[PDB]
PDB file of C-alpha atoms in Angstrom:
ATOM      1  CA  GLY A   1      66.076  57.088 147.537  1.00  0.00           C
ATOM      2  CA  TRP A   2      63.157  58.507 146.246  1.00  0.00           C
ATOM      3  CA  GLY A   3      63.680  59.534 142.740  1.00  0.00           C
ATOM      4  CA  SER A   4      62.901  55.924 141.378  1.00  0.00           C
ATOM      5  CA  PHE A   5      61.923  52.857 142.996  1.00  0.00           C
ATOM      6  CA  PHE A   6      64.193  49.741 142.719  1.00  0.00           C
ATOM      7  CA  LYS A   7      61.909  47.426 140.521  1.00  0.00           C
ATOM      8  CA  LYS A   8      64.553  46.893 137.755  1.00  0.00           C
ATOM      9  CA  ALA A   9      67.625  48.071 139.425  1.00  0.00           C
ATOM     10  CA  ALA A  10      69.039  51.043 141.645  1.00  0.00           C
ATOM     11  CA  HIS A  11      70.775  54.274 140.056  1.00  0.00           C
ATOM     12  CA  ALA A  12      68.891  53.558 136.780  1.00  0.00           C
ATOM     13  CA  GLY A  13      69.507  55.740 134.039  1.00  0.00           C
ATOM     14  CA  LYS A  14      68.471  58.865 135.589  1.00  0.00           C
ATOM     15  CA  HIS A  15      69.521  59.946 138.978  1.00  0.00           C
ATOM     16  CA  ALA A  16      72.940  58.633 137.708  1.00  0.00           C
ATOM     17  CA  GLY A  17      72.966  58.316 134.155  1.00  0.00           C
ATOM     18  CA  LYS A  18      76.699  58.772 133.906  1.00  0.00           C
ATOM     19  CA  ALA A  19      75.679  62.555 134.046  1.00  0.00           C
ATOM     20  CA  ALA A  20      72.780  62.576 136.289  1.00  0.00           C
ATOM     21  CA  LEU A  21      69.598  64.054 134.681  1.00  0.00           C
ATOM     22  CA  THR A  22      71.745  66.290 132.654  1.00  0.00           C
ATOM     23  CA  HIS A  23      74.489  67.414 134.778  1.00  0.00           C
ATOM     24  CA  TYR A  24      78.230  68.066 133.148  1.00  0.00           C
ATOM     25  CA  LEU A  25      79.209  71.621 134.294  1.00  0.00           C
TER      26      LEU A  25
END
């Protein structure tokens, strides 16, 4: 991990926002 610290929770809405950033291809 490095894209974001734990703080609240891991895999927050960003590195794995049900699409990761904005991927879907």
